[PDB]
């Protein structure tokens, strides 16, 4: 089965692009990364940095996770990211997404692997 590490890459890494090209980046990417198979994944973030740069976030600023765990790390620097959010009208299997491109810090939970 897909490891947690493997699933992260799948659902959030997009190192082939410096930023969301168009208003359709999310529609395109949710489908291709397979996030619309049983349902429309309501929200998702794609990060456009190299995987070493994202793995490295795990040796950066330790912060509490949302759920209170203590294995979250915030990047020191802002990163190129694309925010995908399912629209009001999005009805499965015609999953529709609002694409928002921005530079921001990311917080991720890290585990040993």
């Amino acid at each position: 089965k897909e490891t947690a590490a493997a699933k992260f890459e799948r659902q959030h890494m997009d190192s082939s692009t410096s930023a969301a090209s168009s208003s359709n980046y999310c529609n395109q990417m949710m489908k291709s990364r397979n996030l619309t198979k049983d349902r429309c994944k309501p929200v998702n973030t794609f990060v456009h940095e190299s995987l070493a740069d994202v793995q490295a976030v795990c040796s950066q600023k330790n912060v509490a996770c949302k759920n209170g765990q203590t294995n979250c790390y915030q990047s020191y620097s802002t990163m190129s990211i694309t925010d995908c959010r399912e629209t009001g009208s999005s009805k499965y299997p015609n999953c529709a997404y609002k694409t928002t491109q921005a530079n921001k810090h990311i917080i991720v939970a890290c585990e040993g692997n």
Binding site: F8, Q11, C58, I106, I107, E111
Partner: peptide, 11 residues
């Protein structure tokens, strides 16, 4: 080492 497993949030 340590790898990212969940995306908690941005900014």
């Amino acid at each position: 080492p340590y790898v990212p497993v969940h995306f908690d949030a941005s900014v």
